[PDB]
Amino acid sequence: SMPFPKDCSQAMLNGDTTSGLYTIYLNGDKAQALEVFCDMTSDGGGWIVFLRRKNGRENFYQNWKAYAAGFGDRREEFWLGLDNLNKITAQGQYELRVDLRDHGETAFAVYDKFSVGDAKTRYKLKVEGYSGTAGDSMAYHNGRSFSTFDKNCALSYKGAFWYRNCHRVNLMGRYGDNNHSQGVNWFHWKGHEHSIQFAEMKLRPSNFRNL
Numbered sequence: 001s002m003p004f005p006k007d008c009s010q011a012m013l014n015g016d017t018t019s020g021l022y023t024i025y026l027n028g029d030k031a032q033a034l035e036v037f038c039d040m041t042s043d044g045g046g047w048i049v050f051l052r053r054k055n056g057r058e059n060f061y062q063n064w065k066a067y068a069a070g071f072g073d074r075r076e077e078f079w080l081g082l083d084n085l086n087k088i089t090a091q092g093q094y095e096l097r098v099d100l101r102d103h104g105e106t107a108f109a110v111y112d113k114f115s116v117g118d119a120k121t122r123y124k125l126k127v128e129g130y131s132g133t134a135g136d137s138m139a140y141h142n143g144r145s146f147s148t149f150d151k152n153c154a155l156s157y158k159g160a161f162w163y164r165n166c167h168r169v170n171l172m173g174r175y176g177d178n179n180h181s182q183g184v185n186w187f188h189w190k191g192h193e194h195s196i197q198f199a200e201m202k203l204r205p206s207n208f209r210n211l
């Protein structure tokens, strides 16, 4: 019903309730088509998934240009791209949800306010307004620029993130690596010596809860 939906909340309200690949249009512009994976089932649906870890098949030890542009298989392990995340989060007030699952246990984190700055900010993270069960591990990272090995936390832990000194969240770390701080970590859920089997990061308009 919305011809050029700008996110997965506008694609869902279009009656599409099946999780999978949808076209969104940044700023509603039919010339800024982007293929995204929509999670239409987790807490009301309408989520753009921008990170998925689930089997270790994809390499996340990738350079600045790869993190800027995105990589992987949207149906499996992928990173959507920082330029995409900046352009999406510029369209309105968005909320971040993180879904975690490991050996049958689940946890989540929601941040009422989530934004990614442009390349001039080195894609600065904003995350505020925590609730959930995983523990607030992103607060540590709030206001940090993105880091890759070629722009050293990324090099030392062989991943990429809004690193500080160095992390409480390492969802782009080495799959199944339980060595301290090397793996897919969410520190305030499973610490630094437990790599998480399944992880998704996703966003939708913060006002979706009552739209």
Ligand SMILES: O=C(COc1ccc(F)cc1)n1cccc1
Residues within 6 Å of the ligand: 069, 070, 071, 072, 073, 074, 078, 079, 080, 081
């Ligand atoms: O590299 C990609 C697509 O590769 C991707 C794979 C997965 C993904 F989610 C995002 C991007 N580019 C680079 C410029 C336009 C698209």
